[PDB]
Each structure stands twice: as C-alpha cells, then as structure tokens.
Design a protein around this ligand. Structure first.
Ligand code: ATP
Ligand code: MG
Length: 503
C-alpha cells in the first residue's frame, strides 16, 4: 500500500540473493545487498539533515554508489535531483539556487567550489568519487542498514529531473512516485523483462533513460545489469556474449555499426536491442537488421512524461516510427494553434496523458499551465502524426520548424534527402535570420572521407527532389554536428554560431 517507489521495488523481495548489479570492476551485488546499501545511505541522509520532501542534488561520476544514492533518497522520502556530470560550477549555481536542495553530493575534486554554492541555500555537502569513495561512503560505513521506508502517496514527489536544455535553459520536471512506478511496471510487461535478463547499462544516470528506464525496469523485473561507466564499443561487444539486453541511443548503434566485430555471431546471445532518447533513423534500423539480424525496438519518451510510446516486442517494429501509445498512456495529434484533434495521418502537435505524465515544472506554475490543455493532455512540443495502425511518427520538434517566405518547412524531410546522397554521413537543417525571407533554410552537412560531393552538387541533387520553397539557401560542410552528452543534436549551437551568415 505504500506508494514509495523503494517500497514498490523492494518491500516484498522473494529472491533476495539473486544478482542485481555487476559493477565495471566485476563485483557482484545481490538484491539484498543493494537494499542494505540503500538503508545505510538513507540513514546518512537523515543524519545530514534530510526532512521528507527535501531535495538531494547529486553531481557524480557513474557508479553503483551513485545509483544507491538515488534509491536511498527516494526511500527516505526525499526528492532526488541528479545533475549532468559536465555542468560547470557556474551552471550548477542555477540548478542549486532553483531547487534549493538540503544536501548536495559532488565529486571530491569539486567540493570547495560546490561548498560555496551550497552555502547560498544552506545545503550540506557530501562527496562521492568515481571509485565510490568519499565522505558519503565514510558516513555510510558506520550507519545502520535497517531503515523504515517513508510512507508516500502516488502523487508525492520522488524526483526532479532537469530537461536536457536543447531548446532553452533546462526546466525542472516534478516526477511522482506513481509516475515512475507505473511507467517501469508497464515496460517490464511490454518488453517481457524477466529475472533471467542481463542488461548492459552504458548510459548516463542523470537522464531519464539511464536512471529510470534502465534501472527501474531491471529492478522490478528482478533481472540484473552490468553497470559500465561510459559507452565503449569493444567492451559492449564483449559483454553481449553474456547479456541479453542493450538499451542505447542512436549514436550507440551508428558507432557499433562501424565495428568489424559487429556480426550475427557476436550478437547471437542477445534478446533485445532498444533505442531511445533521439530519433533512430530508418536507414540505421535497416543497417542494423542487415548486419546483425536483429530488429531494434525504438521507444519515445521525455523528461516530463517518462515513456509514452513503444514499438511492440511481439509485433512489427517499424523503421522511422516510435510505436503506439503504451498501455495506460493516451496520445493524440492536434492542430498546433486551435488544439482540436486531427484525423489520423495528419501532421500536428503530439499531446499525451496518463499516469506517466509529470506534475509540472518546479516553481514554474505559469509555464506549467501553458503546456497543459484544459482536458489534462500535456503538449509535448513534438510534431508528428499517428498512422491508421496507431503508430506514432515523430516528424520533428516544434522549435525546429522553419518559417520562410510564408511557408512551413520541416527540416527532417530535407535532412532525409541529403542523407540519402552518396558520400554524406548526416545533416542538420535549420533556419537563421534572412532579410528577404524571414529565415533562410540552411543545411549543415557532414561528409564521408572519399565520396564527398560539393555544395552545388548537394543543391542540384535537392532541386530535383524538393519543392522550391523547401530548398536550402546554402549548404555548409562541417566536421561534425554538435551533440549533448546524451547524443542529441544541439541545433541551437548552429543557430548561434551561424546567426549572421545572411547578414
Ligand atoms: N525516439 C525518439 N524519436 C524522436 N525524438 C525523440 C525520441 N526520444 C526523444 N526524442 C526527443 O527528445 C525530447 C526529450 O528530450 P529531453 O527530455 O532529454 O530534453 P530536451 O527536450 O532535449 O531538452 P529541453 O526540453 O530542455 O529543450 C523529446 O521531446 C523529443 O523531441
Ligand atoms: Mg524538451
């Protein structure tokens, strides 16, 4: 009856000695051992001033100790607030001032600088390094394992995750215990996770994917994970011989496809490859199936909504689509302006509703109101369509739409045309200010080493395929596209760098 996520996970534990986590060093941690670790750390949090509802902010390198801190925070009735490991002291100041955590956990090498920030809000600072050592660990070594998991209701907060910051300054999403439990429980069934599953976990844990989807699904299912610090293709390829699931982002798949070790034989023990967090291109899906014989399962979620849709485990996994709405989740497509639902197949704003959807943005009630329809649907900001079979197709972010000379131009279809050309690795299409057209469609293209065409050849190639209003006004060759630490393209970086090209 306790809705606390920790209690949902562990209050009844039938097989306590089963493996939960293998660390990168090869240490093995049982379910019972994980629970006990979380008990010690929960007691530390209370000993360091945690009261129910208080935020615990964590910026640390990835380790099992860092995962335990998440579980312990939730267990103790706190609100877990992970922060991108790369955020500078200056950047952290915004998040700590916004969230006003009671406790901040950071890397030992940054304690002095973070202590000064923490002082502004009266927070206590503990440390945890990449080896799992630090003041938090010292405090936990003498703490009691026994901890009475705090009573929480379905709608009480478990975490605040800040969005990735792709379209603007990151916003804090308030996530409840039921948001997290309902979503992972649904996914366990939908993806047929069992106690026999072994997940290769190579994702960051400050993002919803690596933190909630990977960890909560595995732990509810009573499977295990192999907990790697970063993406390493050869290590991942090595582990596939003794694992069953990989959760990845599209860049995992494009990079693994460059390895000559990626074969049917190397992947033959694997049950399931999942992709999320950015668009898996249909060509990449097909390349994966051609090389390995596996059909990648793509799913779509956001910080604010957890997972909304998924390609079916036991049905057609459709290249370029993110699947139908998950059980319990409603998805529709609406006219961006009027908000009325569109006929199936028409392009508009994707909206979602369900127990997965967050409670709003932290201390931003006005912005929260503006992103919810009157009937409770959340406006995703993603444009797309739902086909006759109910599969959602994401055509792009609303923020990426380019208005030029009175026309709406959808960059994905221009990017598709360019990426189809021989000698092209990938492209990003944006608008930047243009005195004649409002915005000028501009294509940034990453070329292959040998087979590369010129600016003019690209435009000539597009001229035959594309209506005149959709044509890029210029093509710019770049060495790579800017991406965040999760692998998502950062089009605002290109918009800033190239803002004056038509001036
Ligand atoms: N499978 C997918 N296919 C296409 N787009 C995806 C997929 N998964 C995630 N996305 C995109 O990523 C977004 C969610 O990313 P996240 O919550 O990490 O922050 P962000 O939207 O990148 O940053 P911010 O909200 O701060 O601008 C989605 O709204 C969508 O635009
Ligand atoms: Mg977003």
């Amino acid at each position: 009856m306790n809705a606390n996520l920790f209690a949902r996970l562990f209050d009844k534990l039938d097989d306590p000695h089963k493996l939960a986590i293998e660390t990168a060093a090869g240490d093995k941690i049982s379910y019972a051992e994980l629970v006990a670790r979380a008990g010690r750390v929960a007691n530390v949090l209370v000993a360091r001033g945690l009261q129910v509802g208080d935020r615990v902010a964590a910026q640390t390198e990835k380790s099992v100790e860092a995962l335990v801190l998440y579980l312990a925070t939730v267990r103790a009735g706190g609100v877990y607030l992970p922060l991108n490991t790369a955020y500078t002291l200056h950047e952290l100041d915004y998040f700590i001032t916004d969230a006003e955590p009671k406790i901040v956990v950071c890397d030992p090498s940054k304690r002095d600088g973070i202590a000064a920030i923490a002082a502004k809000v009266g927070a206590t600072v503990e440390t945890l390094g990449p080896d799992g050592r630090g003041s938090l660990t010292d405090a936990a070594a003498g703490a009691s394992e026994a901890f009475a998991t705090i009573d929480r209701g379905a709608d009480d907060l478990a975490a605040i995750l800040y969005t990735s910051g792709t379209t603007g300054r990151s916003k804090g999403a308030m996530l409840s215990h039921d948001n997290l439990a309902s979503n992972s429980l649904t996914l366990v069934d939908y993806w047929r996770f069992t106690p026999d599953d072994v997940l290769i976990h190579a994702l960051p844990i400050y993002h919803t994917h690596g933190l909630f989807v990977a960890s909560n699904v595995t732990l509810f299912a009573r499977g295990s994970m192999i907990f790697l610090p970063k993406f390493d293709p050869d290590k991942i390829l090595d582990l596939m011989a003794r694992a069953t699931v990989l959760m990845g982002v599209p860049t995992f798949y494009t990079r693994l496809l460059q390895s000559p070790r990626l074969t049917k034989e190397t992947t033959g023990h694997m049950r399931l490859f999942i992709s999320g967090s950015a668009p898996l291109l249909a060509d990449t899906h097909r390349e994966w199936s051609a090389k390995t014989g596996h059909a990648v399962l793509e799913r779509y979620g956001m910080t604010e909504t957890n997972m909304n849709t998924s390609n079916p485990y036991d049905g057609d996994r459709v290249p370029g689509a993110v699947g139908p709405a998950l059980p319990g989740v409603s998805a529709r497509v609406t006219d961006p302006e009027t908000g009325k639902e569109l006929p199936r197949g028409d392009i508009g704003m994707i909206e979602v509703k369900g127990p997965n959807v967050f409670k709003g943005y932290w201390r931003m009630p006005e912005k929260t109101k503006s992103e919810f329809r009157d009937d409770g649907f959340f406006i995703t900001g993603d444009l797309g369509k739902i086909d006759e079979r109910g599969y959602v197709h994401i055509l792009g972010r609303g923020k990426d739409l380019v208005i030029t000379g009175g026309f709406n131009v959808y960059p994905k279809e221009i990017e598709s045309e360019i990426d189809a050309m021989p000698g092209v690795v990938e492209s990003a299409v944006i608008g930047v200010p243009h005195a004649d057209f409002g915005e000028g469609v501009t294509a940034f293209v990453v070329l292959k080493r040998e087979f590369a065409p010129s600016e003019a050849q690209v435009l000539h190639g597009l001229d035959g395929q594309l209506a005149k209003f959709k044509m890029p006004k210029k093509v710019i060759f770049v060495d790579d596209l800017p991406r965040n630490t999760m692998g998502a393209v950062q089009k605002n970086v290109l918009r800033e760098t190239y803002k004056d090209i038509y001036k």
